[PDB]
Symmetry: C3
Subunit: 206 residues, 3 copies
Amino acid sequence: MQWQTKLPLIAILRGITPDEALAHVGAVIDAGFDAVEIPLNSPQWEQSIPAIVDAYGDKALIGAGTVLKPEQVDALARMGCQLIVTPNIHSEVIRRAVGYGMTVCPGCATATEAFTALEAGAQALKIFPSSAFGPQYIKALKAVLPSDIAVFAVGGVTPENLAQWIDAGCAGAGLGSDLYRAGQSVERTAQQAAAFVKAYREAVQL
Amino acid sequence: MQWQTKLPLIAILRGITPDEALAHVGAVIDAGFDAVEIPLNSPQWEQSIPAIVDAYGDKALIGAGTVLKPEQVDALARMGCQLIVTPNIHSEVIRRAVGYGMTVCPGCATATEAFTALEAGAQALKIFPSSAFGPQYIKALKAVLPSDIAVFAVGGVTPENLAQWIDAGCAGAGLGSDLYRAGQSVERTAQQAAAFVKAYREAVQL
Amino acid sequence: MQWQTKLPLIAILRGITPDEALAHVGAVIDAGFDAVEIPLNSPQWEQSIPAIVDAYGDKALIGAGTVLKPEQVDALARMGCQLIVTPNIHSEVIRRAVGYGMTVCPGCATATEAFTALEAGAQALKIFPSSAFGPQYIKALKAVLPSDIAVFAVGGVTPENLAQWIDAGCAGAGLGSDLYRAGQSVERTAQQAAAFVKAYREAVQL
């Protein structure tokens, strides 16, 4: 499947707090993001996730990252979570999430793990961590995966290096600490988001 | 096991058509190749594979690449396929192929995946994609795998870099787009095959 | 869990013989090592392992490397082995060893394999082979693994590069051929061990 949002960039907001969630999510969205996730190792995700679903779920794909256990999927479903991101391939996590009609983008590092993820019904794939591997690793995989699989680079993706993940055939990227680190200002988030979006538009044109 | 052909180089002919199969396979064989495979993402492999078995199966190991499903092994067996190559480790694919008396060289990326492949009875191993990993990755694995396992580099292997995969302890390599890209001339195939064979003979001597 | 020895460096003595075991183990210990293992591809490990348990097991963590099969764990338990090191993730090997009250540090290469190892009850993790991956790979993993997991670099770790594995967040490293190659002198072992310990003390201070 191709990606089902206007812009194939996932904003990852690791360690954000409930009191600052609405302002930082507003900042990425104002810049043209329409896919956002909050990792479950963030404090009080059980407050900020459903808060953000209600505030921004009509105009963006909202979800969760670092999802490791099936029962976490269950709780997130009741919250209105629409997107599941993961560091690893766990078949039952993927199966349960797909069952709720959620978009799942699970993390793998090898060809074996990637084909496993697809059999579980993953609609997209996350290659993690992408930096250590480089773009040529991704291009080598794409040549053997089904032609229409949406593939995301995650791990040290910058506005400066984004274009080479695009050239390698990625549908997009998930953006972590180069977009958001815990305790940075709203202005920093709005500055970084604009720069990523600008770099993407340039890369796609080329 | 050691490799059971005179020359441990696998010609990979991705995207070849039935009308050009005999000429390009003849070209690699004339150059001294005796192991060839046609990936199942090639158009009309069900015509070119059994055609090539009948024409060249007496003087070369003939097989299939990109084999992902047990039932594909079944169909290939009736065709006279002798060799199975894969991007990933799938235990039942390996088991069924070994059961037909086929030579199997399945693709892995880690130590865990490699030991899994051997328990399924793989007689050789493909490390894929090799370029991103480099020769030192391969040498590190060899130091822990059983001493007589035949190990093949696949992924961006060139006549220029071949020697360093040999120095790292590989029995050989599978050769993709640097040997054959779809729609290249027969002359190009004969030129590239000669260059790989020449580079191998130099590397083994050293 | 944090590491349960004074110094988080594992001496790996691949291919050592029973006649030289006591002298080379004494040399690493005299230098401040208190964790040692002998790989099962070493000749007559069934003599040198229990010999070393009796001589040095009161003042060091003593164990085995290259452990691939559950039944090997059983035999090692009767010998008094306290530590299990591996190249791969095998759930039942880890489970059986943990069951004997042994410290297990199994080898993985991906996030998927690492989470698998933890569910089997591994108290530490070995990232192998670390050199090809580099420190940034390790740091990327640490950011997603539970904060208190003890992580060891194994594969081409030198006194010169040790500090960058420390900076990346490793609890320590397992030291192979740069500490011991088969047939080197006792003096060489004592020289290399001192250099690793010195480099560790410098890295931790920084």
